[PDB]
Amino acid sequence: VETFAFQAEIAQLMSLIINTFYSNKEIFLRELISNSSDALDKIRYETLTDPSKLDSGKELHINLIPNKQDRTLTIVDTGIGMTKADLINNLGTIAKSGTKAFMEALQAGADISMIGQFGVGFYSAYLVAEKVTVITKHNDDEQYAWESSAGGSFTVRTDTGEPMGRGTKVILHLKEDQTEYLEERRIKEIVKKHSQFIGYPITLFVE
Ligand X SMILES: Nc1nc(N)nc(-c2cc3ccccc3cc2Br)n1
- Residues making up the binding site for ATP: 35, 77, 96, 122
Taking the complex as a whole, the smallest distance from the CB of residue 185 to ligand X amounts, in Å, to 25
Strand duo 202-204 + 62-67: pairing: parallel
Of residues 91 and 164, the one with the C-beta less far from ligand X: 91
Residue 11 or 91: the one with the smaller Cβ distance to ligand X is 91
Residue choice 57, 66, 79, 116 for contact with ligand X (CB under 6 A): 79
Q: Which DSSP state fits 2?
A: E
Contact status: 76 vs ligand X (CB under 6 A): no
**Are 163 and 135 contacting, i.e. CB atoms less than 8 angstroms apart?**
no
Q: How far is the CB of 5 from ligand X (least distance, A)?
A: 16
Quick one: which of 166, 168, 195, 200 contacts ligand X (CB under 6 A)?
A: 168
Radius of gyration of the chain measured on its C-alpha atoms: 16
Q: Which one of 29, 129, 170, 202 is in contact with ligand X (CB under 6 A)?
A: 170
Closest CA to 32 of 99, 113, 122, 126: 122
Q: Please tell me the distance from the alpha carbon of residue 149 to that of residue 127, in angstroms, as a whole number.
A: 12
3-state secondary structure of 161: coil
Counting DSSP H helices and E strands in the chain, the numbers are 5, 8
Residues 185-204 that bind ligand X (CB under 6 A): none
What would the x/- binding string for ligand X be over residues 28 to 67, using CB under 6 A?
-------xx--x----------------------------
End-to-end CA gap in the chain: 32
Neighbour tally for 182: CB within 10 Å: 20
With beta carbons less than 8 A apart as the criterion, state whether 130 and 175 touch: yes
Number of residues counted as binding ligand X (CB under 6 A)? 17
Of residues 85 through 104, those in contact with ligand X by CB under 6 A are 90-91, 94-95
Interaction site with ligand X (CB under 6 A): 35-36, 39, 77, 79-80, 82, 90-91, 94-95, 119-120, 122, 134, 168, 170
